Structures are given as structure tokens and as C-alpha cells.
Curated annotation (Swiss-Prot), chain C:
Its main location: mitochondrion. Belongs to the mitochondrion-specific ribosomal protein mL51 family. This is Large ribosomal subunit protein mL51. Keywords: Mitochondrion, Ribonucleoprotein, Ribosomal protein, Transit peptide. GO terms for molecular function: structural constituent of ribosome. Component of the mitochondrial large ribosomal subunit (mt-LSU). Mature mammalian 55S mitochondrial ribosomes consist of a small (28S) and a large (39S) subunit. The 28S small subunit contains a 12S ribosomal RNA (12S mt-rRNA) and 30 different proteins. The 39S large subunit contains a 16S rRNA (16S mt-rRNA), a copy of mitochondrial valine transfer RNA (mt-tRNA(Val)), which plays an integral structural role, and 52 different proteins. Interacts with OXA1L. GO terms for cellular component: mitochondrial inner membrane; mitochondrial large ribosomal subunit; mitochondrial ribosome; mitochondrion. The keyword Transit peptide applies. It comes from Homo sapiens. It comes from the Eukaryota. Disulfide bonds: none annotated.
Curated annotation (Swiss-Prot), chain D:
It comes from the Eukaryota. The keyword DNA repair does not apply. It is found in: Mitochondrion. It comes from Homo sapiens (Human). This is Large ribosomal subunit protein uL15m. GO terms for biological process: cellular response to leukemia inhibitory factor; mitochondrial translation. HAMAP family: Ribosomal_uL15.
UniProtKB/Swiss-Prot annotation, chain E:
GO terms for cellular component: mitochondrial inner membrane; mitochondrial large ribosomal subunit; mitochondrion. The chain holds residues 45 to 294 of 311 of the full protein. Component of the mitochondrial large ribosomal subunit (mt-LSU). Mature mammalian 55S mitochondrial ribosomes consist of a small (28S) and a large (39S) subunit. The 28S small subunit contains a 12S ribosomal RNA (12S mt-rRNA) and 30 different proteins. The 39S large subunit contains a 16S rRNA (16S mt-rRNA), a copy of mitochondrial valine transfer RNA (mt-tRNA(Val)), which plays an integral structural role, and 52 different proteins. Interacts with MIEF1 upstream open reading frame protein. The modification Omega-N-methylarginine is found at residue 103. It comes from Homo sapiens (Human). It comes from the Eukaryota. It is found in: Mitochondrion. The keyword Mitochondrion applies. The gene is MRPL4. Residues 74-105 are annotated as: Disordered. This is Large ribosomal subunit protein uL4m. GO terms for molecular function: RNA binding; structural constituent of ribosome. Keywords: Methylation, Mitochondrion, Ribonucleoprotein, Ribosomal protein. GO terms for biological process: mitochondrial translation. Belongs to the universal ribosomal protein uL4 family.
From Swiss-Prot, chain G:
Belongs to the mitochondrion-specific ribosomal protein mL64 family. Cells overexpressing GADD45GIP1 were more likely to be in G1 and less likely to be in S phase and grow more slowly than control cells. Inhibiting the expression of GADD45GIP1 promotes cell cycle progression. It comes from Homo sapiens (Human). Widely expressed. Highly expressed in the thyroid gland, heart, lymph nodes, trachea and adrenal tissues. Expressed at lower level in liver skeletal muscle, kidney, pancreas, testis, ovary and stomach. Barely detectable in adrenal adenoma and papillary thyroid cancer. This is Large ribosomal subunit protein mL64. It comes from the Eukaryota. The chain holds residues 25 to 111 of 222 of the full protein.
Length: 129, 107, 97, 287, 250, 85, 87
């Protein structure tokens, strides 16, 4: 009516993991999706931008009122004011006018008016974050 | 139980040479030039150095400031700052008082 | 007149009784204990209220269906009437539609 | 850090000192005082002020906007319609690049879900995963993928790299099980058998174009080749490569999991799998 | 033999570990018996005072149930009939004697039934709460690390006079790893002491840490706290409650 | 306050302590059983499921009896189960 | 003081007492017993044999399947006839 076996490898395959895996070693970078690991050793600057859980550059579009468009840089530690002035000098030739920035030094974030998510991601990747 | 000891500290005159002695003990007799540059990355040696200084000087590096002691110069600069320990009544009473002023204390 | 004419007896609050001392211990039962229990399993009180929150109307609906059978005749009549009241109040009355 | 050094100087953090973040807590307005007291933001006396306003959508008498419009079947049978969650090739590639979805093994629903590649709500009329054209270029990986729906272009995209794609139907009762197997294992029930498609989806899965799981494997090679002509790529021989065995593996139409045959029970606590022996039961599950 | 301790869990590249002195309860002059490295993410994160407030307020309020109720006009006894006709007399018109206006009447808007104030802050927020609280303790020289909570004697006056000698302060929170494997000597001592409190690791919370002037931890417990709090970031979103089996959780 | 047991259980609960406790087992079991009468005034649904002509989706069905009133004169005779509706 | 010993799960499976009227319908059911086996194993749970259908239940399952889920042969057969009518 019943028989018992230990052929159980298939059930083990079904169980998921809690920890997000470390990205495996690749032949060269960038990858086909465009993902690139951070430069080692880390770049010698006053400020540092740490990645997200999924190993991405923390840059996010944001909207309010359905007309205010913003860009956010998060997970910033060290002298954020330095990152501010760097972002300032980088974005100013693109806009003509100097961009208007909010600095949240307690939170450790930088908010910029308008969408510059793609440009800023590129720029931070270049810098070695 | 021993009596509670004062938190008051005055840095000695021969701090430089005393630190010379302690470093040359722990890191060995052979000592490279610019000994201030010696890194305290090694955990064991850090402990040994700071223990000797703590036991003799009476003053210890607190838990808060320990990671700041990266290099030997950092230890030297830490011990040259004085701590004077007295209640605020005592400090005000002998603080060049004008004769018209009077302070009393009801604690 | 209607104001006291002497000072009341002074109240002394023992901040270091056992209940005050161990206040809020095991609130981190979940994250620190492998998620065996939710903190909502530290809540004591009414059957219909352990680890749930709602307005008056919702609380009444819930008490009706959870301890409705077991409650006293006059209490239950009061509760059935409450629900009737609140139903009309919330659905048919107010500033905003 | 600098902030921590500032704390060295400041008096102890205690239950006295704590204050909310400015802007988080907005104080409440009460109908007291002189400003908010008389009439208390209700206007002068009328239907409005007494709080007996008519219900929403009442236009004061005239036939309301919503009523006066004709009825039309925009949502006539909305709950019965099937929904497929889309997986882009971009998404799939990015999952493989971060090692979240494993190429050395076959992909199915269960692997993707576990990978956090997708979210599937069986309850919300989801019937699995649709494979979409998006990011056909810069898709460079060789995988054995299992999806319920796929576009011809995405089939082409996978077969160009030397992968194998097939479409297999999942019934709702199978889907909830496959997406989250661990809860099902705790239900103590034996594994049921994956049901066959409904009448209108039989022609879909019995078709080599869509690469159905009930399509004739003899009709496969010419179909693969025809797609190779149309999109102008040299169709590679799968038999030659080392990973051929893996790309071969396909669960049978009545199988939900890879090793686990229907009617088996999993005892999780002692890591055993219990089989029936009874002829009646065996006949029932093997059908 | 000096007591050295390193961080087992991997550190970020840019961050460096903080150190703490290690002492034992065996002697009055038995400070500085060892040195320890602590994970910077748990023990040296940004001081976020808003978070402490958030977590503390959730801790105080989420368990609270209100027992206060009052009777409305409908629930007060009697008050059926109209007290007198509307038109006839000089009197002000009334419908019942139990109206809010009347003395002995029901309440207009009063406390209504058992009320629950239960809500849940997100997990990651409570985790971050614990982290901040721990950094803040070490930043302000209020945190101490011990090899073991082992006492030369169970005499409770020994523990008080040691805290006096070590400038701990009026209230000390003692944390051990497990409830069962807590030493005999510390349990005896702490049982009859008001201000000193012994808890297991799982007990630890923001409220107690803020309430007590000192936090004392063991080396077992410090590795344990690191594990769990650091687990919170660098995990996926759940598919189902974590009490259920995973391929790598417990 | 609350009663310990729901009020609807009291009829059952009282059978357990008094003269009813020491009644024979077979009688109590015959009293307990709650089986439904055969339909008399309603055509029952044949099957457990039925397809809806409205939407073409197969739906569960239940048989819901009409409540039947029996006047006391019915006790003095043999009505096949017919009562006043 | 010392902290009150920490909250825990009830160790091992719980069996409700069927004589008690307070015990709800779901606890006394066979489906509850199945779940106890799944969680706690054969070590503490019910007889493993019980987990499958009874011959009577299998009879009902066979009738259910025959009436609601047709064979692939007959489905293709139905399409063939109805599609042919279309031309
Ligand atoms: Mg937003
Ligand atoms: Mg006004
Ligand atoms: Mg007025
Ligand atoms: Mg009115
Ligand atoms: Mg009344
Ligand atoms: Mg009236
Ligand atoms: Mg009147
Ligand atoms: Mg009253």
C-alpha cells in the first residue's frame, strides 16, 4: 500500500533561497544586459555610492503632482557635498543652466530636478561605483 | 573592592620616549625610521601596545575612539590631550571670579 | 466655585517595577528568533481584537461574527442596534461623497 | 564617521530626547477656537451643512451621466479571460547575467519564480508566462526554456543561440502548485496530475509552429528550419553539443514536477517520498 | 592568553571594522582582557534618530488595547417616551430624557468599545532600528563586550559595586545568548536587583536599550546579532512566510 | 460578559448531566442524527455541478429545501411528508 | 530582574479532544490529520496509508473526471466535426 524511498534530489531542487546570489565571474565586461561589477580597488574619492541588493547603481526616476520629475541618488556615504558639486558640474553643460539640487545629508541622498537617470548611471559606472 | 579612581589625567613630559620604549618592546628591537608611521592594522599588537599604555598611564582609549587609532602617531596625539575631572561648581568657583559675584550650591 | 482648596496626595511612580523594566522585551521575537512567532502573538485581550485594527463599524461587524453566539441577549441586541446605526451614519451621512 | 563623533559630545540618547522627523507629523485641525469654531467648515445651513447630501453620482434630478450612457460589453466576461504575465528576453538575459536563473539546468515556471524573475497570481486568472519579442538582439544565452505562450520571433531568438523552447499548458490547480511547491508539500496531499488543455487551446498545443508539448516531434525539424530561413540564420545542430542531454529533458503532459510522478507524497520532515502500491491507485495516476 | 575576535561575515570593501575592548565580570580590575572587531554595518551605521523614534513609538503602541467604553443615548436605560408634548408648555422641546443634553444622559462622542492600536512597521525598518540603537550605544561609550556573564559569587552587591567602579551608570542591561545556558551566578545576582536586568538575545529591543544607561553584551551574542541583522539586507523578497522551509534559511 | 458555550449548544449540553445522561446510548444517537428528509415539494437538482447558459461556465449547485409547516392534526394521521407551505 | 522565558511554538503535533464540543469541525477532520503528518512527519503524525483516496472516493473521482475532463482523442474529434461544418 505504501513504500518509502530516499530519491529526494528533485524536491531539493524545488526549494528556493533567501539570500540573493553573488553574480558569477564573466569572461569580460560589460555583460549582454549591460551589467558591470564595481571597480576594485574602490575609487579614491571623498564620497562613496554603494550598490543595491541586486548589485545595481542606486539611481531612480521619481514623479510628484504628475508634472514634477526628479532623479534620486541613494546609499551615499562620506562627503555628499562633494558628490553634489560633481553632479552639478557634470549636468550643467547638458542643461545650460546649473541644475537645482536638494541635499538630504541625514538620509544620505541627492535629489535633482528632471530625469537624468541614464546619464547619471553611466557617469557613476565610469567613476567606478 | 578597590576605591573608585579619578578620571583626571595630565600627560607626562617623557611621553615621546615612553612610547618609544613600548613600541620597541612589542614590535621588536629592530625599528625602521619614522616609527610614527607604523600601522596598527595587526589586532594582537594593537591590543598589546594599548594594554601597556593603559596599565601604566591609568588612562585608557575608550571603545568609541579605538578604530581611530590606525597608526602610532594617532596614539601619541591621543595621549597628549589632558582630562580634568571636577563638578561644574568647582570649575566655576575657581574661574577668576569678580568679587561681586556669588555662587552657592544646594545639591 | 469648583476648584480644590488643598493639594492632593503626591503620587509616586515606581519606574523600576518589573513591568516597567521588561517593557517591550520580545517585540523582536520574529527577526531575532528565526520567525517562529509573529510579534502579534504577544497581544493579549479580546478574541476579535488580537492583531487587527479597524474603525468602530468594522470592530462591531467583527465582534458580531466572532463572539456573536456566545454573548448575552441584551448585549447582542445593543450590538445589532449599534451596527444598524453606524451603517446609516457612514453610508448616508457626512461632508464628502 | 563625523556624525558619530558629534554624538560623542552630545548627552545620552534616551526616551526623553526622541523627536519625529520634521514634516512627518502634521497636527490635526479641531472645530474649536474662533477660526475653525463657528460653522466649522460646513458653510451656511442647507442640505450640505446638515450632512444629508445626496449619494455620489446624483445630478440633482436629471438622468445621471453614468446611467444615461448605453451599456456595452467592455468587461462582458472579464473573469473568464486568461492572462499571461510577460517575460522579456531582456529580463531573462539579465537574470542569467546575475546568476539568478541557472543556464546549466532547464528553466520552467518553478525555476523562474524561485529566481524572482516573475510574479504569478493564479487566483488573479494568471495562466503562466508569455515569452515576448522585446530584446531579441543582445540575447546571447543557450537555455532550455518552458513557457505557456511564445511569439514566433522569441522562438527564433532562442533557437538562434542553440536553445530549445517549448510551450506547455498548466491548469490553475497545477499552476498554484508549480509556482509555490513548498506550501503544497505542507498540505499533505499527494501530487495531482496536470490536466489537459480545454477544447479551444488543444489546436494551439498540438502545433509545431508554437512548439507545443502535445505537438508531433516529427513535425519539429522542418518547422525549426523554416523559421531559420525566414529570419536568415544558420540552424545549428543540437546533437553535437555537450549539453544536449539537458536540452532534451521534457516533463510529460501529466507531470507537474521533473522527478516527481503524480500520486506520490512527500514527507518533508524526514526527507522521504512515499509511493502507493495499489493497482487501482497506480492505474488512476498513470492515466 | 589575549582574547581576539574577528568578523566572520564578509565586510564591504570601502568600510573598515570597528574595535571594542573585551572585559570579564570575574574581577573588578579585569577590564581589557581582549580586543574585538565588530561589523561596521551593524555597529557603525548612520545615526538616524528619526528611526529610533519610529521604532520606539511602534514598540510602545502596537500592543496597546483600550478598555474604555461609554454608553450612548440608545444604550442608556429608559428614555423611551416623549417627556412632554412639543407645542403645549413653555418648556424647551425634548424627545427623550436620556439625550446628551440631559443630566444622566448618554455620551455624544465617547470611547467606543475595546479599541486596538495595532500596526506593523516594515521588517527592514525594525532591523535598521536595532542597528542604529547599537551604533549609538558604542558611539557614546555606553556599550560593553564581555567574554561571559560569569560571576565570582552570586552576592548581588558585588555586581552593583562593580558597575560603580567601572562608571557604567545607574541602569545596566545584561544580554546573554540563550535563556537556558545563562550562568547560575548572574541569574542569582540579577534576580533581586531592580535596575540591572538580564535578558536573552531574542529579547533585545530598542525600548530597553534606551531605558537602560548601559548595554552589556557577550561575545557569543555579538556574533549572533551581526548574523541576523546583516541577514536582513542582502536577502530577496519572500515568496511565502519565512517560518516555512527554504533551501538555506535556518 | 460572555457565555462559555454558544447558546445554540445548550440543548446538546444539557443532555449530559441530568436524567438524559442515564438514558440508553442507542436512543441518544437516534436523537442526535440530523439526516435530511426526501424532497416532497421541490424538484431537486440532479447533479452536483451544472453549466450556466448565461456565461457557459460550470458552476456548483446546492439543494435548498422549502420549509414545511406541519399542523398538529398531522400527528394523528399519515401524510407522506406533505405539509402546509 | 530576570526576563520571563521567551515565547515558543507548541512542540510536536496537537490533537484536539473529539468529546469536547468546543473543538471546531476543522480540527476533528481528516484534512487536519494530513497536515499534521506533512508538518511533523510519520514520527508523530497519522498512519501514512490514510493519505490517499478510499476505493469509494476513487470511484467518485473517476466519475468526476469522465464527466468534466474529456480525452484528447474526443476533443480533437469534436473540433474536427465543428471545424468541418465551418467550411
Ligand atoms: Mg515616488
Ligand atoms: Mg470659522
Ligand atoms: Mg457663537
Ligand atoms: Mg437634517
Ligand atoms: Mg431606546
Ligand atoms: Mg424622537
Ligand atoms: Mg419631540
Ligand atoms: Mg451616564
Amino acid at each position: 500500500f505504501v513504500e518509502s524511498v530516499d530519491e529526494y534530489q528533485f524536491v531539493e531542487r524545488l526549494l528556493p533561497a533567501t539570500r540573493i546570489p553573488d553574480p558569477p565571474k564573466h569572461e569580460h565586461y560589460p555583460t549582454p544586459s549591460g551589467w558591470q561589477p564595481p571597480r576594485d580597488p574602490p575609487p579614491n574619492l571623498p564620497y562613496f555610492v554603494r550598490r543595491s541588493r541586486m548589485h545595481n547603481i542606486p539611481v531612480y526616476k521619481d514623479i510628484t503632482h504628475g508634472n514634477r520629475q526628479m532623479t534620486v541618488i541613494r546609499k551615499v556615504e562620506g562627503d555628499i557635498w562633494a558628490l553634489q558639486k560633481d553632479v552639478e558640474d557634470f549636468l550643467s553643460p547638458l542643461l545650460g543652466k546649473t541644475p537645482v539640487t536638494q541635499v538630504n545629508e541625514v538620509t544620505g541622498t541627492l535629489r535633482i530636478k528632471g530625469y537624468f537617470d541614464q546619464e547619471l548611471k553611466a557617469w557613476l559606472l565610469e567613476k567606478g561605483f | 573592592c578597590p576605591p573608585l579612581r579619578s578620571r583626571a589625567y595630565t600627560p607626562p613630559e617623557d611621553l615621546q620616549s615612553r612610547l618609544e620604549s613600548y613600541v620597541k618592546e612589542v614590535f621588536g628591537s629592530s625599528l625602521p625610521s619614522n616609527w610614527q608611521d607604523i600601522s596598527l592594522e595587526d589586532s594582537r599588537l594593537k591590543f598589546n601596545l594599548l594594554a601597556h599604555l593603559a596599565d601604566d598611564l591609568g588612562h585608557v582609549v575608550p571603545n568609541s575612539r579605538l578604530h581611530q587609532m590606525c597608526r602610532v602617531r594617532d596614539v601619541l596625539d591621543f595621549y597628549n590631550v589632558p582630562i580634568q575631572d571636577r563638578s561644574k561648581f568647582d570649575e566655576l568657583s575657581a574661574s577668576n571670579l569678580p568679587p561681586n559675584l556669588k555662587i552657592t550650591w544646594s545639591y | 466655585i469648583g476648584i480644590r482648596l488643598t493639594l492632593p496626595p503626591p503620587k509616586v511612580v515606581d519606574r523600576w517595577n518589573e513591568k516597567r523594566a521588561m517593557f517591550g522585551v520580545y517585540d523582536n521575537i520574529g527577526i531575532l528568533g528565526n520567525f517562529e512567532k509573529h510579534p502579534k502573538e504577544l497581544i493579549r485581550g479580546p478574541i476579535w481584537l488580537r492583531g487587527w485594527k479597524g474603525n468602530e463599524l468594522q470592530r462591531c461587524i467583527r465582534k458580531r461574527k466572532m463572539v456573536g453566539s456566545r454573548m448575552f441577549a441584551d448585549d447582542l441586541h445593543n450590538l445589532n442596534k449599534r451596527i444598524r446605526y453606524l451603517y446609516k451614519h457612514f453610508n448616508r451621512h457626512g461632508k464628502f461623497r | 564617521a563625523r556624525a558619530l563623533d558629534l554624538l560623542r559630545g552630545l548627552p545620552r540618547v534616551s526616551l526623553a530626547n526622541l523627536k519625529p522627523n520634521p514634516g512627518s507629523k502634521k497636527p490635526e485641525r479641531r472645530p474649536r477656537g474662533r477660526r475653525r469654531g463657528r460653522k466649522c467648515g460646513r458653510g451656511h445651513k442647507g442640505e450640505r451643512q446638515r450632512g444629508t447630501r445626496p449619494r455620489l453620482g446624483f445630478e440633482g434630478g436629471q438622468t445621471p451621466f453614468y446611467i444615461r450612457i448605453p451599456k456595452y460589453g467592455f468587461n462582458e466576461g472579464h473573469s473568464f479571460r486568461r492572462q499571461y504575465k510577460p517575460l522579456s528576453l531582456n529580463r531573462l538575459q539579465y537574470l542569467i547575467d546575475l546568476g539568478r536563473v541557472d543556464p546549466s539546468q532547464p528553466i520552467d515556471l518553478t525555476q523562474l519564480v524561485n529566481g524572482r524573475g516573475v510574479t504569478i497570481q493564479p487566483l488573479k486568472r494568471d495562466y503562466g508566462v508569455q515569452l515576448v519579442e522585446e530584446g531579441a538582439d543582445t540575447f546571447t544565452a543557450k537555455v532550455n526554456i518552458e513557457v505557456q505562450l511564445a511569439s514566433e520571433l522569441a522562438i527564433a531568438a532562442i533557437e538562434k543561440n542553440g536553445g530549445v523552447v517549448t510551450t506547455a499548458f498548466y491548469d490553475p490547480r497545477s499552476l498554484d502548485i508549480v509556482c509555490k511547491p513548498v506550501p503544497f508539500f505542507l498540505r499533505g496531499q499527494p501530487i495531482p496530475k496536470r490536466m489537459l488543455p480545454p477544447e479551444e487551446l488543444v489546436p494551439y498545443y498540438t502545433d509545431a509552429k508554437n512548439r507545443g508539448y502535445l505537438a508531433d516531434p516529427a513535425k519539429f525539424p522542418e518547422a525549426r528550419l523554416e523559421l531559420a530561413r525566414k529570419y536568415g540564420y544558420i540552424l545549428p545542430d543540437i546533437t553535437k553539443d555537450e549539453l544536449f542531454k539537458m536540452l532534451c529533458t521534457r516533463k510529460d503532459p501529466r507531470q507537474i514536477f521533473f522527478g516527481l510522478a503524480p500520486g506520490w507524497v512527500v514527507n518533508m520532515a524526514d526527507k522521504k517520498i512515499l509511493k502507493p502500491t495499489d493497482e487501482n491507485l497506480l492505474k488512476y495516476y498513470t492515466s | 592568553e589575549p582574547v581576539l575576535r574577528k568578523v566572520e561575515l564578509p565586510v564591504p570593501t570601502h568600510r573598515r571594522p570597528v574595535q571594542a575592548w573585551v572585559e570579564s565580570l570575574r574581577g573588578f580590575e579585569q577590564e581589557r582582557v581582549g580586543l574585538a572587531d565588530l561589523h561596521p554595518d551593524v555597529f557603525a551605521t548612520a545615526p538616524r534618530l528619526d528611526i529610533l523614534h519610529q521604532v520606539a513609538m511602534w514598540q510602545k503602541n502596537f500592543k496597546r488595547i483600550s478598555y474604555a467604553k461609554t454608553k450612548t443615548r440608545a444604550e442608556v436605560r429608559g428614555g423611551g417616551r416623549k417627556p412632554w408634548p412639543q407645542k403645549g408648555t413653555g418648556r424647551a422641546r425634548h424627545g427623550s430624557i436620556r439625550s446628551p443634553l440631559w443630566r444622566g444622559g448618554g455620551v455624544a462622542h465617547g470611547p467606543r468599545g475595546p479599541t486596538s492600536y495595532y500596526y506593523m512597521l516594515p521588517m527592514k525598518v525594525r532591523a535598521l532600528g536595532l542597528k542604529v540603537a547599537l551604533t549609538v550605544k558604542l558611539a557614546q561609550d555606553d556599550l560593553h563586550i564581555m567574554d561571559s556573564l560569569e560571576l565570582p559569587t552570586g552576592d548581588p552587591q558585588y555586581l552593583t559595586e562593580l558597575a560603580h567602579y567601572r562608571r557604567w551608570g545607574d541602569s545596566v542591561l545584561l544580554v546573554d545568548l540563550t535563556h537556558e545556558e545563562m550562568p547560575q551566578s548572574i541569574v542569582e545576582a540579577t534576580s533581586r536587583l531592580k535596575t540591572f536586568n538580564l535578558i536573552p538575545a531574542v529579547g533585545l529591543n530598542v525600548h530597553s536599550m534606551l531605558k537602560h544607561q548601559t548595554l552589556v553584551l557577550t561575545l557569543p551574542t555579538v556574533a549572533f546579532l551581526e548574523d541576523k541583522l546583516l541577514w536582513q539586507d542582502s536577502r530577496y523578497r519572500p515568496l511565502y512566510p519565512f517560518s516555512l522551509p527554504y533551501s538555506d534559511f535556518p | 460578559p460572555l457565555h462559555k458555550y454558544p447558546v445554540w449548544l445548550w440543548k446538546r449540553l444539557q443532555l449530559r448531566e441530568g436524567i438524559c445522561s442515564r438514558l440508553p446510548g442507542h436512543y441518544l444517537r437516534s436523537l442526535e442524527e440530523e439526516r435530511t428528509p426526501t424532497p416532497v415539494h421541490y424538484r431537486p437538482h440532479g447533479a452536483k455541478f451544472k453549466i450556466n447558459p448565461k456565461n457557459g461556465q460550470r458552476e456548483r449547485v446546492e439543494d435548498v429545501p422549502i420549509p414545511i409547516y406541519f399542523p398538529p392534526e398531522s400527528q394523528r394521521g399519515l401524510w407522506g411528508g406533505e405539509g402546509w407551505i | 530582574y530576570r526576563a520571563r522565558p521567551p515565547p515558543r511554538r507548541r512542540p510536536g503535533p496537537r490533537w484536539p479532544d473529539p468529546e469536547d464540543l468546543l473543538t471546531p469541525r476543522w480540527q476533528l477532520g481528516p484534512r487536519y490529520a494530513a497536515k499534521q503528518f506533512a508538518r511533523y512527519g510519520a514520527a508523530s503524525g497519522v498512519v501514512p496509508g490514510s493519505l490517499w483516496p478510499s476505493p469509494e472516493q476513487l470511484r467518485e473521482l473517476e466519475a468526476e473526471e469522465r464527466e468534466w475532463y474529456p480525452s484528447l482523442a474526443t476533443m480533437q474529434e469534436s473540433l474536427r466535426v465543428k471545424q468541418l461544418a465551418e467550411e
